[PDB]
Amino acid sequence: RGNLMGKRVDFSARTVISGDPNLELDQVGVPKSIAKTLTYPEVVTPYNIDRLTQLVRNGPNEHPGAKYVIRDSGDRIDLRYSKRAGDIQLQYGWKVERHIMDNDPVLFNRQPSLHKMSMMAHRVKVIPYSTFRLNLSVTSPYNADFDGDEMNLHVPQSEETRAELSQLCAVPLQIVSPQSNKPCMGIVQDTLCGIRKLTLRDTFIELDQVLNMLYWVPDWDGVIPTPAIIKPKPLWSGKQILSVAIPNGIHLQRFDEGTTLLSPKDNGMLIIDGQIIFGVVEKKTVGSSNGGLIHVVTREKGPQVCAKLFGNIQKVVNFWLLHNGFSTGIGDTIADGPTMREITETIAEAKKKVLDVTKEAQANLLTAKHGMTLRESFEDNVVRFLNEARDKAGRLAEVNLKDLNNVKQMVMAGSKGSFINIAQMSACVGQQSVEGKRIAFGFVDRTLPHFSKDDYSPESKGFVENSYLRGLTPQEFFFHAMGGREGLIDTAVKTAETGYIQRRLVKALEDIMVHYDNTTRNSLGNVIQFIYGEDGMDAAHIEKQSLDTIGGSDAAFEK
Amino acid sequence: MNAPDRFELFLLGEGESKLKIDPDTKAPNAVVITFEKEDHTLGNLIRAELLNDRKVLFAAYKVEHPFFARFKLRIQTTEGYDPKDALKNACNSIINKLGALKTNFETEWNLQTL
Amino acid sequence: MIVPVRCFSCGKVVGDKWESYLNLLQEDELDEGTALSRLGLKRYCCRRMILTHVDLIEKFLRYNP
Amino acid sequence: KAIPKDQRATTPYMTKYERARILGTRALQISMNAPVFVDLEGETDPLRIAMKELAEKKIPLVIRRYLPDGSFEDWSVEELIVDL
Amino acid sequence: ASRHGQKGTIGITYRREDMPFTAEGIVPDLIINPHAIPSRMTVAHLIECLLSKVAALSGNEGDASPFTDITVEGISKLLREHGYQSRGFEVMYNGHTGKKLMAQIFFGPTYYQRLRHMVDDKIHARARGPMQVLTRQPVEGRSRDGGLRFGEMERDCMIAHGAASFLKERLMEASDAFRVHICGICGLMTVIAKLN
Amino acid sequence: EGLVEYIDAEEEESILIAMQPEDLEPAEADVDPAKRIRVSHHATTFTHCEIHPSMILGVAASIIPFPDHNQSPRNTYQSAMGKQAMGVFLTNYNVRMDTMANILYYPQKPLGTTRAMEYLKFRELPAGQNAIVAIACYSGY
Amino acid sequence: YDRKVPSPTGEYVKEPEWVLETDGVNLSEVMTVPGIDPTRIYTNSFIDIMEVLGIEAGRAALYKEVYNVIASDGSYVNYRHMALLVDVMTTQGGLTSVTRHGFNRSNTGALMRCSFEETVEILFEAGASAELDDCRGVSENVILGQMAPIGTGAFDVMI
Amino acid sequence: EEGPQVKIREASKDNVDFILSNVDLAMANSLRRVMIAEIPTLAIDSVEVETNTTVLADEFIAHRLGLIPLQSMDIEQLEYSRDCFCEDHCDKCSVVLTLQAFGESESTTNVYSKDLVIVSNLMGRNIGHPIIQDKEGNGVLICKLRKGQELKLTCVAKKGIAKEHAKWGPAAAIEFEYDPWNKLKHTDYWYEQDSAKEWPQSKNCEYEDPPNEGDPFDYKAQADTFYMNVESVGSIPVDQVVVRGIDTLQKKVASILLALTQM
């Protein structure tokens, strides 16, 4: 287990990681002192020597040099010691362990490795400061964020091995994933809250920015496109410049709820030939979505186009934003005075619901729902009554927050957060729960020693009524604690139970593979599937289309 | 540790010239000036005044990455004008304002008490 | 651990204002909010530096040798 | 056993894996001063030579595809089709 | 990082000029991202900042004692009496360009922690080195220029990819790789290298 | 003088504890809307009242500014991290010879404090400084 | 329960129907009752399904359950993946666990079962019986540090 | 005179609140940035330590002296140590100081910047004097001593600039605002009810006119007029901070232009 199917290994590195937006998707900012240490055996040849010798000359401590040279006999020349270390005439048919350089192929992984995607070949770009740096939108497959996450890096030694990494493994080829026949990388955080504000109709950008932005995009064709507006002051729309980043032969049609080829909600999406026609761009368009601009561009133009797409979208939106700016104050959880009155009573009327069911049940009138205890039915009624209270008080808050409320602004992008996160911050936080039920009776027939025995009312059984803003009360706080202790617990137990699944799943399947007859079989030759997937079709190359033979009127089938 | 010394921001290395000029391949009458060991203080000011002159078509700058102290100006000018002049005129135009200012401040500095 | 020379964010000198600050509280009997304004600290990055700097040095000087 | 030049089912297109290692094993030989059967418009890197050797089908290798009984078919890199 | 479970590493260092700046001349010591504030509902962080602003100004202690009559409002009503906007927004200027920022920004003193775990204490990197007596594999830990474990699980991923040769190269030429002799009959490491 | 009793878990069982003594036993007889929503007096029996509620918290979480206005597992994270915070661990660090000990250069008492910081001697031996922070998208680094 | 079923006219629409949900299992005797539709009746105990309706119906439920584990959280996984797992379980004739009893007794070369929970024994009863390991298995060429019959090593190269 | 124009309003020994009329923002900025980051100054870039029995550590102490404000009025006739032709320093590109203070008294002996001691031949130029604005007469609190502790040091101040390390900053704060009312609409104010009862009004609204509610129709609005205030640290008085800012800016613009001449 530990020495034969999983060894410790030479030519490897490991470091803290941190995000860098001006770095192409498939790249990895390898810090210098590591690239000073790691080494790829290159064989002398007429094609290289001139470069190659200059390295042996540079010596193992100024970046683009090298360590060890090796000769016919197989004797190791050590470049840091040795009298003859500023000398040495490189002889064809020798080798030269050398400093990893820019644009080399390397396997760059994060543990745990529960994917193909947790291992992807990148493209080196050597840098100062001691962090493996990477592009944001290679975050997901690895499942990294930059609050400490440490990451490994392996280096190939063989010429064939380099190919294997650059040809089968590399980051652009993994973009569209077989796992869920969808793309596994999207556009996240800053970039994404931006890919949107930029694109509102309202958003207007005038000349001087336009020219920088234009220029910012590398693949820019150098043709100031003609401003939508020419009159008084010739502006461009957001959409307009973002359209530059979008290549040509790219066609996308969306349609959400209120969408009409006029789109008075700037709804859906319409894109014709590297040009955006209407509709805000947000996660549905440019997320790791199925219809996804990224699913499209990858299949249509090619992987390598889509790789360079990510960068360009990023660099423009990251910029515009940098000059527009964005924030979040407690003000962004505050809400309208008369709504904090409407929320209040919206809870209060639910507190009377419960009361009345309870006083009802206290008279043996409460009817048992076929097959559950009168006490089960009471509970379920109550639980529901305050789940619907929280959610109603919550929805109530979702509306004051105006189109400028920075929390909501992220929510509309789909960058972070949700309705729930508003609810708990601005409204009431809700019913706490342990093992599916509302707070137990640990003490005898009572929750805490600050309550009378036999007390099934909300307060007493773990309903927190205030918000994460106004603040909880002692009791509330202590129930709430029990909430996400359970949470933490099964979280770190979720990880152990599952860790084992993914080991076994792997070990049984493991040796299954599609053989050269389009069968599907293990090491014994015992057939398992007669066609892979039953259609012999790689999951990547596949997508949700409609079958219009299936639906609608015998008339309109024929119309 | 991997940290590069601070002086590598305003001091030119070995065979590294303040201006390295290349002619933009995509457009015509167009030019991309690399500026080494300089930053936004400079490129922004050049760009603003590189747009006041009415015989200029296009100008923009960008710091390709903040780690390094380089920046890339791109100028495209009208049929006739050679950007190297557009830039020269520009630069001079600036210097005259800065002198102008330097005087005018020193003028009004002197009139006040303390 | 001794007063910091020059405030972090802003830059303005402040290590010259410690002994003077402590003498405004304890001696002409003033609240920290006035003292801080008198000594020429009108921003709050420059302010927070004094209202906080805690003078542990007074307590390692305590050890003999 | 064997198998003829005829009676070959086995995709007449190239797998990515076949290619992958053909590009590898060639990249190898070029990188060890063995001859290049192309003209280089101006390349040094052993792989991107072999990419060009291949994309003018002048690579002299033969894949031997194994079927799961104990048999196989031969395929010259002239025969196989580089779609991808 | 902060005080409410909002851990974060430095991504970069900018000099005072390149920072955004408030009209009063002030520049921030540290900029966090707004995207890490909705999902972990770390509201206090925001409140602290509001309170701590007020306190540094008026020259008093910020009382953030838990179960109290202190209010986001109660603070905000004070922060105004002192001439800033009551939710700690301040108009800022992008220092690159001098132009104003289109959005107003949350700005205030917020008590931050420095944590152990710095980088230079982690940045282990090997390129062949010592090997354990028994196994002849590379050694554990960076304290002695050890390897990194290409664990069972990372193998699965190389198999997934279909990179066979790479799997051999990693599992042999780096780490364990040795030659033995073997009898062509009683197929065993019985044999006898009188090798010479 | 019998003003205070020592109560364990088991005896706790047979009592009634008041939270705040003020608002929890004067006669019943407006509400600044931004104040939180505490419950009511509904209880008459009160045998001993809680000293003050913050004393349900341990050493670490007592350091947190406003943990009530905060998701409960977040507080728990800070409480495993206040113990990796760099500061002055003891005045005499200069004279103790120990493997590995880090001390901050300009230790700074916090601006936002807990009443129970006083007994934890946190303002006297801080860990952390008092930064001007800006919540914003900038370079996207 | 809700259902999408053809109108006489062509349009797919919501005939809302009546379904009974149970707490406990005896397939053997419920589908034999009056009034139920035996052609539909479903148990979450796929194990029962097998022993009643034969293996090929049991495969289908075993999938349909695994699906509901995943789909209930939101997650989509493209069929073929789950299909394979399910199909590997269900091909020795019966249901074959993904623990050491099902897939690690299953007549494979010894070394591949070594590389999993019960290691030592498997080598012993391999020993005494005198098994012959094929060396066609991933896990076995990895122990021997050779090219694996995998993407790059599934074919052979020549001249 | 010609274009760019000034009106001083308040003026002190360290404050210069002025109006800067008729200019691109571009430059009002690039001035400010330079003023921060590019004007040269003297401060301590090498401490040579003989004996330190003090509480504090060697390089802690070092750090502090680095930050110490030093006279820099005749800086522009000192040289950068990297430029002169002398091994290490020379009184032509450095200024050496000494610190000797020894715990004598029972009652806690203080070491101020006042106790720094010019050694090197100045050459009769105003350079490297610990700057003291302190009323009681002692600059900075360098460090404290007990009964029997020493500090025995040798500082070496060199010419330098903010970009390299911020000790060479000659300026703290740089108040900066334009278009007090959002006439130009460069920002989009954030609000609960009234965008204009909810923010406040800078003193800078007095020296400009309102909008008169109804008055929209034209277009094209640029930024003249910027309301600054340079707070000097003392190394240079305030006037020179703005001036040298303007000069040094002008100087590196020169250096490009003259680098076309040279190509």
Place this chain on the structure above:
Amino acid sequence: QNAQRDAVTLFCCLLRSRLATRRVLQEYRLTKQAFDWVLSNIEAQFLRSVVHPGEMVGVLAAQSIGEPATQMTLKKVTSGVPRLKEILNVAKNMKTPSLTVY
């Protein structure tokens, strides 16, 4: 050549639904030249979408379920992870049995 007919079946049912005579002509007005392109194009675009012999799906399928499994975390059913634990074990001893009769 029967298997061949079967795998394709569904793909065509789409193909014939899209490329049918009212539709080609009236819906999306094609022309011969473009049409014969659409045609030759699809064929390749199909061919490209085939599985490559070598594909180690064994693992791939495991991983592809072994991952989103680790992403589950929190109407009376055994659901998520424990259910997955139940199913793969081939649980005789199961906790939420249920019949569902129509």
Place this chain on the structure above:
Amino acid sequence: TLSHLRRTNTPIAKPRQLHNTHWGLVCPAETPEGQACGLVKNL
């Protein structure tokens, strides 16, 4: 240092849950994460 002196440890139905009676005696928040979670408590 204060915290580590004030520490508790428990060897081995459901003991990891914050339990009602802990109110006032044990700290609700203070606890390590993961594989000893809630078994280790702080007073």
Place this chain on the structure above:
Amino acid sequence: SNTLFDDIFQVSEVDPGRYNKVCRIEAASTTQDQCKLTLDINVELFPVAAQDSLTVTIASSLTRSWRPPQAGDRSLADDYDYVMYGTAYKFEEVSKDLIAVYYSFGGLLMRLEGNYRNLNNLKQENAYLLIRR
């Protein structure tokens, strides 16, 4: 080289849809009672209001980088105040004897509907829009 369409309209609804700098305007054509219009408009740059009478043109006229001025000495179809340029994307048969066209001026959308606009509002990239007085 020429002009494609012309009409005087009158505005009914002026619609701010959670937007300050843009309004979409449903306006109708004096003259022909088989014709109406829908227009997303920068109302910060060119104000507009209730019961208004506006003048329209389309054109394809008075494609390399966009130079600006040097045109305070040049040709301009700029007797008009407000002026945009868009691509066009759909030609919808309302059925009839009646037809509508759709333009996008960088997302500022347009709807238009009549039936002489046949040999007169091409299928094309070009489409300025010039709105006067």
Place this chain on the structure above:
DNA sequence: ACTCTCGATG
């Protein structure tokens, strides 16, 4: 009952 770094003992 993933990969990690540290700190300790017969």
Place this chain on the structure above:
RNA sequence: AUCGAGAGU
């Protein structure tokens, strides 16, 4: 070599 605290999703 054997045990004890922390890293990250």
